[PDB]
Amino acid sequence: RTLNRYEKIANDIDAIRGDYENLSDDALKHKTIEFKERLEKGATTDDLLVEAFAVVREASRRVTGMFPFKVQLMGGVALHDGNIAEMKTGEGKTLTSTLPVYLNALTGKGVHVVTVNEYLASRDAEQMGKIFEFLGLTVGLNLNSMSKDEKREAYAADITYSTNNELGFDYLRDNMVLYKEQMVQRPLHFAVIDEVDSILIDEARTPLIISGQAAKSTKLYVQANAFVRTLKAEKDYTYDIKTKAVQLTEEGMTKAEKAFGIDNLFDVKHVALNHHINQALKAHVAMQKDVDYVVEDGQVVIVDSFTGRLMKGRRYSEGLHQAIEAKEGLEIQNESMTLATITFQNYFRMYEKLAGMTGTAKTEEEEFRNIYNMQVVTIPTNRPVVRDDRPDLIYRTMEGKFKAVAEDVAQRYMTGQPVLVGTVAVETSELISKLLKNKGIPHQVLNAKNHEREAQIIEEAGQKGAVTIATNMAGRGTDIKLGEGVKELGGLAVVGTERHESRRIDNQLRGRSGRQGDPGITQFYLSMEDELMRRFGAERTMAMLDRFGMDDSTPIQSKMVSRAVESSQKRVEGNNFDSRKQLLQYDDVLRQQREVIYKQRFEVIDSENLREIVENMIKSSLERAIAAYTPREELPEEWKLDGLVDLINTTYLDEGALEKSDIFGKEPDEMLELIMDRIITKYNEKEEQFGKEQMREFEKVIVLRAVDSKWMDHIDAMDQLRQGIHLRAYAQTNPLREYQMEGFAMFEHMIESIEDEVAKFVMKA
Amino acid sequence: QRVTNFFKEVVRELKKVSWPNRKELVNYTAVVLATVAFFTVFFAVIDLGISQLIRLVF
Amino acid sequence: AKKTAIAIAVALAGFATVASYAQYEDGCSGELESGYYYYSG
Amino acid sequence: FRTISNFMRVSDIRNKIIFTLLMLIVFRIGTFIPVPSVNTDVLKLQDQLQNFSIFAMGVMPYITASIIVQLLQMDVVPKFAEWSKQGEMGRRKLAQFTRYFTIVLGFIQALGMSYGFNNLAGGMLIQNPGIGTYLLIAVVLTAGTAFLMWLGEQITAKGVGNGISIIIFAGIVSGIPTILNQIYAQQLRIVRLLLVALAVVAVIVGVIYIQQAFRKIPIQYAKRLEGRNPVGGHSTHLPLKVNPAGVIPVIFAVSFLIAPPTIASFFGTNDVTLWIRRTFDYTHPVGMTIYVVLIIAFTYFYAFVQVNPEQMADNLKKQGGYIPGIRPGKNTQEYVTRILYRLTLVGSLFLAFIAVLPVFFVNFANLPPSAQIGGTSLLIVVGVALETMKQLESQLVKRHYRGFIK
Numbered sequence A: 001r002t003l004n005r006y007e008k009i010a011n012d013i014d015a016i017r018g019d020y021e022n023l024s025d026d027a028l029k030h031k032t033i034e035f036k037e038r039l040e041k042g043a044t045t046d047d048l049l050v051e052a053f054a055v056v057r058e059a060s061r062r063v064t065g066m067f068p069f070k071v072q073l074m075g076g077v078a079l080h081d082g083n084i085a086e087m088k089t090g091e092g093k094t095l096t097s098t099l100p101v102y103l104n105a106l107t108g109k110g111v112h113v114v115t116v117n118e119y120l121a122s123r124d125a126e127q128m129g130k131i132f133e134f135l136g137l138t139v140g141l142n143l144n145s146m147s148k149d150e151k152r153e154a155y156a157a158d159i160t161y162s163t164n165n166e167l168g169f170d171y172l173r174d175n176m177v178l179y180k181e182q183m184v185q186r187p188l189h190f191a192v193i194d195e196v197d198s199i200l201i202d203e204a205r206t207p208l209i210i211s212g213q214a215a216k217s218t219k220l221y222v223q224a225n226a227f228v229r230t231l232k233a234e235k236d237y238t239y240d241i242k243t244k245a246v247q248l249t250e251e252g253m254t255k256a257e258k259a260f261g262i263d264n265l266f267d268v269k270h271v272a273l274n275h276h277i278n279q280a281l282k283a284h285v286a287m288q289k290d291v292d293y294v295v296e297d298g299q300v301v302i303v304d305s306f307t308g309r310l311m312k313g314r315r316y317s318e319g320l321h322q323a324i325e326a327k328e329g330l331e332i333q334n335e336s337m338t339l340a341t342i343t344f345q346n347y348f349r350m351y352e353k354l355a356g357m358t359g360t361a362k363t364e365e366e367e368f369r370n371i372y373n374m375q376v377v378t379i380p381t382n383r384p385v386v387r388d389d390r391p392d393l394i395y396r397t398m399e400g401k402f403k404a405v406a407e408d409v410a411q412r413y414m415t416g417q418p419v420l421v422g423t424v425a426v427e428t429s430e431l432i433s434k435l436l437k438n439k440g441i442p443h444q445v446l447n448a449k450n451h452e453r454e455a456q457i458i459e460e461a462g463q464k465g466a467v468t469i470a471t472n473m474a475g476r477g478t479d480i481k482l483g484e485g486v487k488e489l490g491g492l493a494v495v496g497t498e499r500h501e502s503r504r505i506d507n508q509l510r511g512r513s514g515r516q517g518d519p520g521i522t523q524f525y526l527s528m529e530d531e532l533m534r535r536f537g538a539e540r541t542m543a544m545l546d547r548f549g550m551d552d553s554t555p556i557q558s559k560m561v562s563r564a565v566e567s568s569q570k571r572v573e574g575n576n577f578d579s580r581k582q583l584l585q586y587d588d589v590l591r592q593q594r595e596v597i598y599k600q601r602f603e604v605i606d607s608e609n610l611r612e613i614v615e616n617m618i619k620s621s622l623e624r625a626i627a628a629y630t631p632r633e634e635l636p637e638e639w640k641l642d643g644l645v646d647l648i649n650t651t652y653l654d655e656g657a658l659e660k661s662d663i664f665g666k667e668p669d670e671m672l673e674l675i676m677d678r679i680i681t682k683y684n685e686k687e688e689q690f691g692k693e694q695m696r697e698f699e700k701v702i703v704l705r706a707v708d709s710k711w712m713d714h715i716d717a718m719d720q721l722r723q724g725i726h727l728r729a730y731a732q733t734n735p736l737r738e739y740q741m742e743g744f745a746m747f748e749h750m751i752e753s754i755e756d757e758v759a760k761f762v763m764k765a
Numbered sequence B: 001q002r003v004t005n006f007f008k009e010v011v012r013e014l015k016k017v018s019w020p021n022r023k024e025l026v027n028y029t030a031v032v033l034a035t036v037a038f039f040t041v042f043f044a045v046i047d048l049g050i051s052q053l054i055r056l057v058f
Numbered sequence C: 001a002k003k004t005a006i007a008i009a010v011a012l013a014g015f016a017t018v019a020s021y022a023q024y025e026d027g028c029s030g031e032l033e034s035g036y037y038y039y040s041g
Numbered sequence D: 001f002r003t004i005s006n007f008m009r010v011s012d013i014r015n016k017i018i019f020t021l022l023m024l025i026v027f028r029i030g031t032f033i034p035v036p037s038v039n040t041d042v043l044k045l046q047d048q049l050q051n052f053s054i055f056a057m058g059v060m061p062y063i064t065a066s067i068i069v070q071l072l073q074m075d076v077v078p079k080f081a082e083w084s085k086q087g088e089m090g091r092r093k094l095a096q097f098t099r100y101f102t103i104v105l106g107f108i109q110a111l112g113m114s115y116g117f118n119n120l121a122g123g124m125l126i127q128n129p130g131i132g133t134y135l136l137i138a139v140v141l142t143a144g145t146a147f148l149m150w151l152g153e154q155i156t157a158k159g160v161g162n163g164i165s166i167i168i169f170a171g172i173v174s175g176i177p178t179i180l181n182q183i184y185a186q187q188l189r190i191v192r193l194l195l196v197a198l199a200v201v202a203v204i205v206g207v208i209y210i211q212q213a214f215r216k217i218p219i220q221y222a223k224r225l226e227g228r229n230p231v232g233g234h235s236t237h238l239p240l241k242v243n244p245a246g247v248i249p250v251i252f253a254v255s256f257l258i259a260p261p262t263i264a265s266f267f268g269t270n271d272v273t274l275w276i277r278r279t280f281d282y283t284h285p286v287g288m289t290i291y292v293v294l295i296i297a298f299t300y301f302y303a304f305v306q307v308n309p310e311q312m313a314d315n316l317k318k319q320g321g322y323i324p325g326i327r328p329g330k331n332t333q334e335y336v337t338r339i340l341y342r343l344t345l346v347g348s349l350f351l352a353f354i355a356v357l358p359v360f361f362v363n364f365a366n367l368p369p370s371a372q373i374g375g376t377s378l379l380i381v382v383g384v385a386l387e388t389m390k391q392l393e394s395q396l397v398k399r400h401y402r403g404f405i406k
């Protein structure tokens, strides 16, 4: 019903192929001006799809010599219709990005192209920049290293290639701006997101968070870490393998109360040092050194969990990164507090039109339709894959597993074909590297600290005798071109190591191996004491694993473990799915509140006269004050109007500017109107006292500071309530329902605090 | 004595329960009475209607 | 205890199977009720 | 009114109300299906020494089967224990076991009710070609139970939540018009009805004042790094209900009190048969004391099954939540269980009072013949009404966001 439509449009573009093949180079550069003049006449983007794709399909051949396939045209139309276009891993999914971005950049509004990491961003940006800048448009590029002027010139171009973290951080640093011309990102139009199962599925959990500075404390971390250094590995603390949660035992609690001299660890007085013991314990035994970070040049530089790259700017929250820096004897940088927060779901729900593509999406088509209202189109390949996904040789121990990995890489190096060795962590990669060092194999390690060498390795890793050990930098999106005579031997032979947390992440390595119909061999070599099995393995299989002996020279052949592997990884992907469906409906509350507060902050920013809005804030504050001091079910003769005029003379007016004999016993709305008459006279006197130019800047500084400070405080209180909202289900209530009601209540108290504090600071000075 | 001390603990613990106050109490009982009265009227109308339908069609 | 829970689980189901003929003179219905940040702003 | 007038302006809430009332109309037109291949009017002419339709069994097998599954998701069955500890993935498999166990349990209980009916009627209701007619009755009642489940799932999907509880509520409040026209044919004319209405409103506000009552325990997570806007008494806690058991112990005491009369009716007339009928009379104090002590014992039992201090203290230890002054491992279990000792005594005495309310109410009012005001149905009406209205108020308070710009 749609695939035949895509085939029909692809045959139309292939039919009008012959008209644009004999044109000059200046004709195709004039052709984008012709399309833009045609869009400035009354034509929609959908009526010009066939001519636009014919022009791009000629221009890409003119630039790079490669010519788009009819399958790629099907994918381009399925991207332009606004839903996810799944193509198999290695079939040409950057030229299917090249197709609709031209048509949707003709409107004059910007088109963002999203990808997972800066290497793929740079590669796609240079190649498609050659295509588009031959064709006529202008192409930006967004990085972590760019200044705000270079970012503004990048978004100011027609087409922007970027990652996801930098789009989220630019949005959050544009909703933290003081001027309307200082912010970076344009109003959002269209985002062709690449590796959608990575960005909107795997990483939707995790939010982008820009944090501001805070005051520094240091005397707790060192002491807490000093105390944890001397604990016993299972007598004092219990490291749960499954959920990675650490708790002290009762002997450990007694040792804590003995070491710190306190009478009771668990109390309201010692919640700070209880937190520091918990975070020092988590930093010592929960996360390991090269597994979860990297120590470069005197600072803890963490690795990303999903793409395995070196996040050189980000810091752990809740005072964990300071506990790591106190663990390894570094200097303790000052702790921060949250200034803004978004998720990738709530960020990419702000684009006017989404479009996406990946290699594996029919696993998550249901969640795509239920969240983003995007359905997955399954698209052919036009050449069948010759890649043979051999079954996974499941061994018994880690030592025998890596021994068999080294034997396989030696056997395939002696015949002369490339081998890529998948990994997850980076100390496992160093282990495989020093295991292949003392055998005679010139390998070439691809760590989380070797990104210039990522560029050269991926240039020189499809040659006659190259061996690569890749943690996650060549585990998604990375293409490897086969050298001379290589595909006559088999091409890349991906020898995977660890079974990942998804079939998608598993199949991406298979996609590295086999591309464009070239052959390729994949074999996972996983153990039975891997991190996956040791965390989320069935207890009966770990009991019945005893019947296999100890000789780890041959893989375990029985089907019980070959059922337990898929059972464990379906368990971990179901746990991630359930954790996402708990996070979605709890972040929709802050989605509502954040869109309200950011829209109103932006219309504060781009306004030129804040007089009526500041007066309305003062009216709301003053009517809440008189309604709080003059109750209606209580007798109208006893209202404590002396206390009312004391509060008004303290907050709003001067000392002797109001007394009880001025107004007494009158109706409260006319009392509100009289005090607002006094407010407007004092406001006009102050506005004439230092000019009606500095007054608007002064009140704009006060309003923006109020919004930013109370929104910071409300994010912190909202997270503190989201911690313990799940305990409410012990009264058979609904925790989401109680979360929504109490979140609305504290949102209204936030707005009341904003209005009261801006009224006090405006009418103070 | 177990009985007297236990009953003192019970009557002391009943001072630390979040009881409803008077306005929430009268709002809740107005909700309950209005709901049960509306559904008596509603199912009585449907009872008379299905009685007329089974009298006519049978 | 472990004997107590299985004894109650047998006894409730058995006497519910017995009193499947219910509501002899009455009526009963029943009811059943790690994140990291990017610095600066 | 103001609140329902605000309800009937929002399109989403209005569509949910229309869908819920439409499914209740579907429930009533499914209730009014007489003679499902059964006796014609023997249920009307042989009732007294009364509800019989395709919905005569109801969702009571679903209730008691989910009770049995809630008892079996503990250390009794290790397969169900690892289903319960295997995240939100195995709960669907446990609910599938609940569904199939419900189907087979209702298939047994419909045959048991049919055997009780043709034993109390002397078999003079319909002729039998064999066991196939009883199998047909069992298929009809099991399909009616599954149809009530489908309506409950439709109401908890697109209606206003808790569809099984709304079906139970609708089945309860559909007989009170027959109670009203019987008491109007029956009819001190006022002055006694005013006393009855004052008593009913006093029992209503007592049920409100007990059910909407929480004993909150202050849980403090350690994760407060600094002050970082300390409001004071923070709004995180562990709310324990005063009566955690629900209404289930009424069902347990009624079942265990009417099953020995069933086995006494099976054995025929005997001296011990007449003795156990007189001692399980449920109106005389000799049986009433047994009913009260079964209420109290099984509400302690099902309160400890419902609020489980072992798993609660373990969950608080794993999440980091402690009580100020109380260690998370085992002192938290002891503290929570010696709070629950004190709360469920009050819950026990309240639910025993409302359980023995209708017999004293009828015996000291004497004007209605068979109107049970108290008992279980009062708690069902109160709970479903309050929960539905809190759901609708939350669906509006999600909408009414204001802002600060004016």
Ligand SMILES: Nc1ncnc2c1ncn2[C@@H]1O[C@H](COP(=O)(O)OP(=O)(O)O)[C@@H](O)[C@H]1O
Binding pocket: A066, A067, A068, A069, A072, A089, A090, A091, A092, A093, A094, A095, A477, A479, A515, A516
């Ligand atoms: N139309 C085409 N004609 C010839 N070669 C192509 C065509 N489209 C893509 N390719 C080549 O096929 C390979 C596919 O790589 P890439 O597009 O990076 O894979 P993915 O789709 O996973 O991103 C690229 O090397 C590209 O050079």
Ligand code: BEF
Binding pocket: A088, A089, A090, A091, A093, A358, A359, A476, A477, A478, A511
């Ligand atoms: F889907 Be491709 F391999 F990036």
Ligand SMILES: [Mg+2]
Binding pocket: A093, A094, A477, A478
């Ligand atoms: Mg790619």
